[model samples]
Structure formats: C-alpha cells, structure tokens
Target: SLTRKQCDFTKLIMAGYDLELNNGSTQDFDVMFHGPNGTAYEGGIWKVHVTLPDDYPFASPSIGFMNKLLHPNVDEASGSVCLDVINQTWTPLYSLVNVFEVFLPQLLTYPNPSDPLNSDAASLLMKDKNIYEEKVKEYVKLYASKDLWE
Candidate 1:
C-alpha cells in the first residue's frame, strides 16, 4: 500500500541525500542543510524536521526546524517554517530535494518580511538590519552546531 512513497525515499537514500529517515507510521525525516553562502545565515548547520502528509506528493510535506533560528519566517516557539512553496504555491511536481536544496536555501537567502510568521524577527530585520544580522549569527552560534545534531 505504501510502496510508491517508499521508493521515492529509497532512491533519495541510494542517491546519497544527506538526511535521516525513519520508517515510522509517519515518514518522519531529519534533514541538515547549511545556510546559504554570503547570507547572514552563513556558517550554520540548520537541522529541520520533515513530516509527510497523508496525501504526500499531492500535498507538500510540512517542514519545521528542530533547532532555533532567528528568521522572519520561522516561528520562535514552534520552529514552524512558513514558506510560499510549502503552503500556497505547492505543486506535486516538486521533488523531495526541492525542500532541502532549493526552497529552503532561497528562504534563508531572501527573507520576506511581508509574510512574517515570527513578528519579532521581522520587525528586527526591518528596523535595524545590522542588529538583525547579529542576532541571526547569535542564534546560529547557540543552536546551529554539529554538537547539537547527534
């Protein structure tokens, strides 16, 4: 019954995608991606959790952060990630890699305060970009580390 999605993940594993998968009742995943280079989010190892919806490819998987990150789109308490592609703009054509490789990197590089989930970070980014960058780096140092991964 679950064979279709199984191979999607199997192919990803065989193809050497750097993610941890659990064959639990839900297709829960642990993902690690670096902050996009040249962005204030650089030099950070960001860990994310992926939860596949029942409808899956027909729907977008929900991606959230396991570690704290100071971003306009990421909720401080829940660590929920708010992104266009993950919500309003989703399409079944998108692959699993898109979340880790394309969509997330783009989100990190270009934050859209116009659609803020975490209001404080959005206000900080808008009010003083310098201090926002500093805060982003500070969170990176505190939470985004290899030590936190294991």
Candidate 2:
C-alpha cells in the first residue's frame, strides 16, 4: 500500500514540481547546480536522482547524481550528496522549490569542502581552481551531453 507520503511524493513529481512529499506532507528534493542558471557550472545540466524508500515521510528520500559531476559535496562514484538538511537540520516545512532555490544556487556559487564526498576532486578544486573548471567542462562534455533517446 502506498503511504500518504508516497502518494504525496508521486503527486508532486507527476505535477512537475520535483518534490518528495513525506509522511507529514514534508517536502524535499535534490537539486543540481550545473545548469544554465548556475554560476561556474553554467550551460551544464547535471542529473540528480531522487529515490523514495519503502518507509518515507518518517524518513527522507535518497538523492544522488547519475552523471559524473565535479562537486565537493557529491561523490563521483556513489553519487552521494552531502547536504545539511538531508543529514541533521531537515525541517518538514521545506518545499521542493525551496530546496532548489536555497541549496542549488549555493552549490553553484560556493561548494563546501569541509564535508567532501569527492575528496580528490575537492583537493583539486582547492589546489587548482582552473584545473577544476577544466575538469568540470570535460566531464560535462563527456557524460552530460546526450539526446533524449540516448
């Protein structure tokens, strides 16, 4: 049986709002900053996969990246994301748009290195900014660009 949270989440996604609605109507979603609206990652469209667990609402959905993105908070191999709300400070009041508006923009502007999911990439980002940019561009070209059918 689909729980209330599951129903709500399914509704949001079908509605094109990109929200993961939890048990108490708690909404959350993963955001990718490597798009045209982003700063350093402008013109790139990163894929973020949101997976709802069997027991949701009481628990948050799992979010991860599908593409090889160059971000401090994202793991390249596992695609695990390191966001504060997803970890500790998650409030039931947050919405899907809020997730994108708040965290996505911040990710584009300032990637957090203190808690890195990609340590080597983070090190490169810290040590060589130019090299990091180049790598990001290369990764985007190699992995992100594709036709809908492909």
Candidate 3:
C-alpha cells in the first residue's frame, strides 16, 4: 500500500538520495547509526529496516534491521530494535527527523546492555569485549559494506 508521496520519496532515494532521507511506503521509521565513540563502528553506516503501521501518527512503527547486526539493543533473530521514541516515551511533537537525530547518535555513543533484545549479543558485549569487537567488524564486512552507504 504505497501512497503517491511515499512512492515519490522512494524513487528520489533510489535515484541518489544516499545521504538524505530514503523512501519506503511501508516503512514509517528511520534507523541510523553514529558509530561507537572512538571505536571501530565509528563512521560505519548501519542498515535498518522500518515498518510503518496503518495507524502512523498515533502509533509508532516497528523498527529493526534487514541484515544481521551485533548490537545489545537490537534483537538478532527477529531484528527488533529497542528505542524509547518508538515505545513508551514517544511524544506527539516528535517528527521522523527527530527520531533519527536522537537515536542514531545515541546508538553510536552508548549501547544499552541493560535492556537488551539480543541476549547473546549483550552477554558477549559485556563478558568479552574483544570478541564482541571482532564480531562487529565481521558484520560490517559481511553486510554494511555496500552502495547504500557510499
């Protein structure tokens, strides 16, 4: 069910809106990453998948990734993302731009392990820092290295 506006946006992005907002008719949410502070994930562009619900403005859309990611907040199997703006703390005043601005930067600065969706990723991140780093690098090599980022 793609609206004319959504379709146009999608086309715009596909044509070359690489660094700007992309389009998805079913996608109501925007996902971004800011890389870990002074870490390897820094400057890395992570791919996210956003699924917009029928009731958009009233209810938040589901957010996640299409590719496998190694983040404490993201569920590995289902690719479910955990973010406050998409949940209980969401405010009506918030716009799509606001969501991206806030979460993308936060993701890079700090990864919350306390409320983890991927328990295994969280455990590995907490218990073994080196291995976690290695895994993240592997994921980047496997998935995030594509024209979507460049």
Candidate 4:
C-alpha cells in the first residue's frame, strides 16, 4: 500500500518538483512549486497540501493551496482548489508529477472563470480582465512570495 504512493512521490521528486512528507507518511505531502511562467502568478512560490486517498492511484488526491492566490478557481479564505483533474478527470495513469506539470500549470495559464469558486475574482475576471490580473499579481506579492518558506 505504501509502496504505490511512495513510488509516485519519488517519481515526483525525481521529476524535479520540491515535495516533503508532512507526517513521515506517503499520503500527506507538502508540495512547493513556483507559478507557471508568463502568468500573473509567475515568480511567486506556492505550497499545496496533498492528501492521497487510501486507495490512491485508484482515486485522485485531494489538493488544496496553503498560500493565498487570487484566482477564480481558488477559494480566498479556505484555500480550496478547483481543478478538473483532481476533482473529476483523474485516473490512475496520472502521477503526482503530472499534477504539477500538466494540471496545475494549465489551470494557472488558462483559468475558467465561468466555473469559479471565488465569486469576486470570477466576476472581476469577467468584467475587467486587466484588473483581475493586477489583483492576482498583488496577491502573489503579498502571500505567495518566494521567500515565504524562509
């Protein structure tokens, strides 16, 4: 049971993402990564809390951002993340690395404001995209700073 999750965790590290086990267990992890390039979040670092289901690899991991990021798909206070892969489209074929590399990057690069968790951010994105981006950058500077882990 542990081997399956541990293998994926090792693969995630080998793929060059910074990850740490929260409780010396394979299921709970703290994944530290930077924002995707060319987005308002770029240059900002974020930590995501990942909790794998006991049937992991068979079920998707539950992931939530610990850092505050102003985005349509993210809850401001709760830090819940809204992504299709982890919520609906997940498969055993995908690994932890795939989450950081493909799913998360794509989410930041192309946010879907039509389906939003943060109503204000979603409304702003629809009404004034430039302002929304500015707000994202502001939040990045305030909460997602690269020096947070310091």
For every candidate in turn, the CA RMSD to the true structure comes to 2.3, 5.2, 5.3, 1.8
Error of 2 at 103 (Å): 2.2
Candidate 1 Cα outliers beyond 4 Å, as residue runs: 1-4, 23-26, 83-85
- Which should have the higher lDDT, number 3 or number 4? 4
lDDT of 3 by residue, 56-84 (tens): 54566566765666678877786677855
Worst 10-residue lDDT window, candidate 3:
17-26
Candidate 2 Cα errors over 4 Å, as ranges: 1-4, 10-38, 53-58, 83-85, 146-150
Q: In model 1, what is the error at residue 73, expressed in angstroms? A: 1.1
The whole-model lDDT of each prediction reads 0.76, 0.60, 0.59, 0.82
Mind giving the per-residue lDDT tens digits that candidate 2 earns over 9-117?
5444554543332344333444333454535566666566665555554555566776766788877887767755364534554453444446556664677777787
Per-candidate TM-scores read 0.85, 0.68, 0.64, 0.90
Candidate 4 pairs with clashing backbones = none
| TM-score (C-alpha, index-matched) for candidate 2 | 0.68
Candidate 2: Cα lDDT at 91: 55
Instruction: Put down candidate 1 lDDT per residue, 53-136, tens digits, no spaces.
Output: 778778777888888888888888878888563675467877777667678888887788877888898899899988889898
lDDT of 4 by residue, 24-90 (tens): 9888888887898899989999898888888888878887889897777877887778755356657
Stretches of candidate 4 above 4 Å error? Answer: 1-3, 83-85
